[PDB]
């Protein structure tokens, strides 16, 4: 299943120390982010160099060249640029085509990769120029040759010129011997690299917007038979049945389904038979979404684990190969591909988001998942709701493809080129967004929890006031069963603004069940009305009280307590230390989302994912 | 003409010093740009035109609201809860604001954005629909003045509820709004208006929604859009007429019976101009001596014969666009619609940015338009065949072993246009059901003109390395007129000095002037090369028709291999037609502003760090002085 | 005002006989379109106005290639070969055609679009630039009245060389070549030529390019786009007023002031004509009562897709108008190259043969479409949901058994496939530019390319159209049917009330539940005990028995038979008044011609499980109406007496 298969990438991501770069051992996209992100992974060359060795020296026995290339080269302009993260990620993957012992690279220029690699040292380059990665490459060399010109950082401040960043490391400017220099800017290292970080974030944030469906069926009040084996068996997608088998095991045994299922049991003929598709029709959403993203992350690690450069130099049969393994057509594709698909993910995201926001559709929920109980002053997630229209737009619109742009390029002698690099950044971008949707919906879903668990607790109020009520003004056995019938049948959030007030749904549903009772009960008559007038004063006294006090008590603090996504609600209130949303809460939307968004960002987040998912499969 | 209008925009742009905000007054798009960019320009909002209105408007809300009139956003709920009513005014304004704020910091939209955003609110609330008070415009005056703007997220509207809500965070002091005072400090909300001295606002009734409910955000990247448009338009509409001098084009192209004839507004103004730059060219004195010799291509190819026509359609556009933009910001983006004068509140949707937004669509279609030319001309220049005898990439070597001259440069430019192109997608197409399905039209016009911006950086690049390259060409057309003087002397001397007939002395004279000097100027007396190749055709041509000849022509190829290369080598040397040209600014601007000269091996300077300087001059605005001085006189 | 200009254009398409064509009037979109659609329209090509310079350009042309005179495509290659030179001049002119006839049939370019290329192509002559014969210029206006067209391949051309091959393919009786004449005989070229009375011309210096080089076809096609833009654009901003009419909305939103204080010139206009179309509006009578009755518990503002209309119609008005006048000034232009100053003596090289003009604008028109087509569907979703429906059934759904009648459903869910695909035809085909012909060709417009995507476009617009009308033609109904429904449940409710002897209080109380409870909502069993009306009955009874707790037990009584003897008449009369209405204020309404002409003129009904007629042929007559035209006149009857 993808889903272990995602697990490892995670795994693997937080507990690599050191990265192991030969020519046999696979660098995974899950490796890449991991010495982009985490500074204490370190670069480990293991000499390999016998290969590398003899292939340096075939080019140089078989023959200021290359020193012209890399000045032509240097045509980038700074506006933006490429995050250090890439930058070093491109050199990690520069380093290991090396390793094939195909380029004519000396060891030595291979060390100084390592050495810079683990002493935080990169170059400063433009973000543009590449059709895929000349020009970006180019500045790799121009640091390890000593160029003025080239700016390096070390770290997150310094920025020194090359000769300078190269001695506060210990090192000296190379002279490039024979191919060297074409060596260095042939390759798709920069394409490759953004796709790197790229597919790990799709593997992790697929997971999570897979899991954080089941979230939303349970406060949804969703059916969960919609994720049932058979369904899936039966239209037989990879994708769609591994899905499923996920959502089935998340809603298995849940105390939210079990409200789901007493809920659709009252009023059952007026309550709709199905879900909506953003729920019912998710694993058959996901699908696609989660092949693509799995097919193509082992595109861009066939990438990684490559000798992308020309001429592949053949040292065992005395021969130079003339091709374009630098031709990042692969990887340009296939992040064309997963931008579709991450617009496809946050469709899914917003439609979920929709139908949360609205009382016609949410099941009881408030409209905009307002607590109020003043909603003239309380209009909850609507900010976040209207933002979320703004993110799935511009998702949908960098979801167009790249690879159909392709220019006539370098006096027509590219006429065929990727543009990998530029369609990985907007793969990256559409990323961003998606980050932001789910934070949204994840706060989203913690405030719909609140919402449901207070929704109990306020209906076993007006239940236990209406049947003390009831005794005390000695209402008969027949009218006392259609009042509680009442209290049980009735939003809770439709009268939450005004418990006693007369055009209200609680009063309403209470009024016709007396006109009801005392025309079943016209066999005293002026009694039972002296008794039902009696019953509206100790209601008009007491409910209100009974249900403020109660909200007031949950709100300075358990259905989720049983749920699988107890990790999520946990991590998001407790660990991040957020609230019920309401006007009684200080805190902006923004600064609950916010707390939430960077815990997606810098991987936090994978704690309360995998905690969710411990036990499964 | 455009031309005019433009020239006009750039002039004002320049020349404002204070920006006046009376309701009256229309505000420009340079007016937007001039605040944006330059600090010392100030807003004047003026109390003699537009106060009695503003305090008229503001007093009307403020009684029909404790009257208990059922106005929406006053007495009723936001958006799609206007079923709602209520008499707490104070607290419905302020609720709207903590639901607003709910924007992350992920990037931020920029200073210059936020303050523009600021400018176009302030000028929304002088028509005096709004209802907000006086003290709040003045608030906004004084904060714009004093450089103070929130700090504000990029994305969140689909237009500008969340981005406006951060300027009312600001206003009414909340502690979650970070503020910026100049560049280097940064505080929050409440401790920023203490250091302008200002309290924080209670909101009165529609005070929030009025504050909230433009288009400001949308329309201010917009502005700066518009202006960038028109000035980066005449930038390359003139940079044709420097494409023919150097690439020996035919100005045929731009005569006036051709556009009079199919007379498209964008048609005729682009090729009046081009047709007065290159009227009396010396360059195209050159053209015309070029194709004399050997008459070679009848046409030039599209790149330059189409320019008018391709022009066309993406003048026009950049111009309406602008109307409609200045309309926007001259405008009353708000609701409802205050009329005191006939005692009501009108409910409508001028929050709505669909003319911002659609035309936000247009424009970055006309910009790609514009790349699209841009590389055509480049690619054109970067090939010896279709350059008309510049060397390929221009490189000038001679060495071209270790000179791959503008290569680079070449690759860059594909991949600018390439993702231009992908760049003018709409972005109106992808309009979501929003709001609790209340928005279900919305402009999405903020995220459109981001784009169209991101558009116009990429174009800027472009323009930056056409400009370039067309210096570099300049260089080399006029160092070929000098080494064709010195082969012609040379061979003319030698002839003599052999003693050659007069039928021998004309083909190899001939031959020197005819042949493209950067095809053998790598290895001047190398027998495979054009030269030396059409000098033997001669050299058994004369023979024939005047048949020790053989041995005055032996001695004439073997002294040539001894002083040609060197004489070559001389002019070239001193080296490292434009003072006629109408370009000399251009020319004179990027050789001696910016402290550049001839790319080649010899020049240690990388393409990065001179295209860096030209582009640098496109993006503050110094590139405008010899655009300005290159167009005087035109009318 | 625009509403004007496209109302001209409708006048100019129908009135108009004969289209002249004389190098100095010019042509319109209507005109192009009348010829192309209206056979009765002939081509008058005036001798008498143009012929002089046409005839001198004809012969300096002629004259100066056999001199031998240096001039492109007369005596030198086309294209990226202009160095090879030649003194062959009939030769170079049949060569040129040979090469271009390369396109191939898969699909081809209607007749109506190439008819209008071919006068598009003879208007370009006119103004004597060309060098083209006279007689060849008589041949296309012989052809054209004739009906005889060459058929066509879609694709191939970048903008027309390709397409504009097979009209001179046509003029040359090549045998490959099929032409048509009429709607059903299709015979060879030369076959075609005698049957018209003209034998094969002869190309002498320069007429096989002056055929070639132009932007007939792309302009050709955005000139009938153009025209039917306008005209569904027109019809859209109308119908916006019906919606509003239909579902009960505020007409405050068209109030001058709003528009004159954010004053784009299409909002302005379009917010001007909605103004219009609703002042002392019957319906919008019933929308004020409709707010009037539970004020404080219904909307206060409407939704975006009407109160915000004015404003998405202003750029998308103004995009339309723009790009007829870009359109028109290329249909008369003189689109060709070389361009012949015959005046004085020179042969100018230029790209007038760029269609780069038509081409963007294309683009612009395609997402205004799209724009239009978003619009609609929006209104359309508001009108098939009951919560935003204002008390009309979801889908539209007559019933009163819902069960077996789910209204227009399939209409709501084409109306989302339409839009969907509308918005993914509206990305830009300029952006798409390949370097072309050997190189020479760097930039090129694929304006005949973009045309057909917004001609295509243009298409599934008149299917949101013709389901939008169609919608709110059953709204109106069920508007009116529900203000009858009312008047019953109160009438019944009133009588009955009296009959009990019931207080002034009860009675009271109980009307008002009459009025302010939606019929929709109870319409399927309006007597059952948990539907709104026997809730808010059983509310008020109960409230009374509270109120006046004088004699009491007597009066449960009579409340307990008012509701029993409700079961008795109630839906028996709510269902006669139903059934009378299957087999009043549209009749005070400006948009009575177009319900007018959907019912009866193209006879159609209230949509329920008792008409046995399908979605579709209820639809599809109101689509071919917007298709052939016929849909102008109950719209200029609308509009009689605006502005």
Redesign the interface.
Same mark, same amino acid.
């Given at each position: 299943s993808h889903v272990k298969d995602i697990l490892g990438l995670i795994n693997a991501f937080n507990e690599v120390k050191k990265i192991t770069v030969d020519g046999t051992t696979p660098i995974t996209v899950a490796h890449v982010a991991a010495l982009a992100r985490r500074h204490d992974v370190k670069v480990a060359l293991e000499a390999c160099r016998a290969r590398v060795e003899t292939c340096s020296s075939w080019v140089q026995r078989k023959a &200021?060249?290359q020193e012209?290339?890399i000045?032509?080269?240097?045509?980038?302009?700074?506006?933006?640029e490429l995050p250090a993260t890439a930058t070093r990620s491109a050199m990690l993957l520069r380093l290991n085509s090396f390793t094939y012992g195909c380029s004519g690279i000396r060891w030595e220029v291979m060390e100084a990769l390592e050495k810079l690699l683990n002493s935080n040292v990169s170059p400063k380059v433009?973000l543009?120029?590449?059709?895929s990665d000349?020009?970006p490459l180019?500045y790799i060399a121009g640091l390890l040759i000593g /160029?003025p010109?080239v700016i390096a950082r070390i770290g997150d401040d310094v920025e020194v010129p090359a000769p300078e960043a190269l001695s506060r490391v210990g090192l000296r400017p190379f002279k490039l011997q024979a191919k060297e220099g074409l060596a260095l800017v042939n390759g798709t290292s920069f394409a490759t690299a953004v796709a790197s970080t790229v597919m790990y974030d799709a593997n992790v944030l697929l997971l999570l917007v897979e899991t954080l469906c089941g979230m939303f069926c349970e406060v949804i009040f969703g059916r969960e038979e919609f994720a049932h084996p058979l369904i899936h068996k039966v239209k037989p997608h990879p994708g769609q049945i591994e899905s499923a088998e996920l959502l089935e095991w998340l809603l298995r045994s849940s105390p939210f389904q079990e409200l789901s299922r007493e809920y659709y049991s009252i009023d059952k003929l007026?309550k709709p038979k199905q879900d909506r598709y953003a729920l019912r029709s998710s694993p058959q959403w996901l699908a696609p979404l989660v092949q693509t993203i799995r097919d193509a992350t082992t595109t861009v690690e066939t990438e990684v684990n490559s000798a992308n450069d020309n001429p592949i130099i053949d040292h065992a049969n005395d021969r130079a190969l003339h091709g374009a393994n630098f031709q990042g057509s692969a990887v340009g594709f296939y992040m064309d591909y997963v931008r579709i698909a991450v617009a496809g993910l946050g469709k899914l995201l917003?439609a979920q988001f929709?139908e949360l926001?609205?009382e016609?559709y949410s099941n009881g929920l408030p409209? #905009?998942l307002s607590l109020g109980p003043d909603?003239?002053?309380?209009?909850?997630? /609507?900010?976040?709701?209207?933002?979320m229209?703004?993110?799935?737009? &511009?998702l949908?619109?960098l979801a #167009?493809?790249?690879t159909?742009?392709?220019?006539?390029? @370098?006096?027509?002698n590219?006429d065929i #080129?990727s543009?990998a690099l530029?369609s990985a950044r907007?793969t990256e971008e559409a990323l961003?967004?998606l980050?932001?949707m789910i934070?949204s919906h994840l706060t989203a879903m913690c405030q719909a929890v609140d919402l449901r668990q207070l929704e109990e607790a306020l209906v076993k109020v007006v239940e236990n006031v209406v049947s003390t009520l009831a005794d005390e003004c000695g209402l008969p056995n027949d009218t006392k069963a259609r009042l509680l019938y009442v209290a049980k049948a009735v939003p809770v959030y439709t009268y939450l603004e005004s418990p006693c007030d007369?055009?209200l749904p609680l009063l309403?549903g209470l /009024?016709?069940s007396?006109?009801?009772t005392?025309?079943a009960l016209?066999k005293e008559?002026?009694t039972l009305?002296?008794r039902?007038?009696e019953f @509206?004063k100790r209601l008009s006294d007491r409910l209100e009280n009974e249900m403020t006090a109660v909200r007031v008590l949950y709100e300075k603090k358990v259905r989720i307590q049983g749920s699988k996504f107890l990790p999520f609600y946990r991590f998001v209130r407790e660990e991040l230390d957020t609230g019920v949303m309401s006007?009684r809460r200080e805190?902006?939307?923004? &600064?609950d989302?916010?707390k939430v968004?960077d815990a997606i960002?810098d991987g936090r987040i994978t704690v309360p994912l995998l905690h969710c998912l411990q036990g499964f499969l």
């Open positions: &200021e060249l012209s290339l000045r032509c080269l240097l045509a980038g302009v700074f506006t933006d433009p543009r120029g590449s059709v000349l020009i180019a /160029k010109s007026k917003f929709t926001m609205i016609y409209g #905009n909603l003239s002053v309380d209009y909850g997630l /609507k900010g976040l709701d209207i933002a229209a703004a993110y799935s737009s &511009e949908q619109y #167009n493809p790249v159909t742009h392709v220019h006539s390029a @370098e006096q027509h590219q #080129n543009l530029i907007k961003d967004i980050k932001l934070a007369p055009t309403l /009024k016709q007396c006109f009801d005392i025309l016209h008559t002026d009305v002296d039902l007038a @509206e006007a805190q902006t939307p923004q &600064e989302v916010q968004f960002a």
